[PDB]
């Protein structure tokens, strides 16, 4: 899954900025959120988020839904490494399990249940 943020910031700068942002906000995880390419769905103004590490995936669904101006009845799926993460997991658990070597967590969102 291609993230534009990776193409526009080289790995080394990403890594040093992730280190800095984990030090400044130790109880928050930094997350990159991008729309999946083929998804017919609202785009998001910002990509970089600081998220409380005890926030659940469901609560993240709620907040992201608020930001793309979706109704609760409209569909919204998250993907971490092309897999839908469990709704009950915390963002801290997701970070520990799936953070990349630049200290960032990468999440894609779509209106479809399969990434593409």
């Amino acid at each position: 899954m291609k993230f534009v943020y990776k193409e526009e910031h080289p790995f080394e700068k990403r890594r040093s900025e992730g280190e800095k942002i984990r030090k400044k906000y130790p109880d928050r995880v930094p997350v990159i959120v991008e729309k999946a390419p083929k998804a017919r769905i609202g785009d998001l103004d910002k990509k970089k988020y600081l998220v409380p590490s005890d926030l659940t995936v469901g609560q993240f669904y709620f907040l992201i839904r608020k930001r793309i101006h979706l109704r609760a009845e409209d569909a919204l799926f998250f993907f971490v490494n092309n897999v839908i993460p469990p709704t009950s997991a915390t963002m801290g658990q997701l970070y520990q399990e799936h953070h990349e070597e630049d200290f960032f967590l990468y999440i894609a969102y779509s209106d479809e249940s399969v990434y593409g």
């Binding site: 942002i21 928050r28 910002k46 970089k48 988020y49 600081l50 409380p52 609560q59 709620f62």
Partner: peptide, 8 residues
Amino acid sequence: SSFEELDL
């Protein structure tokens, strides 16, 4: 460029 904090 910056990070947007998200809370409930």
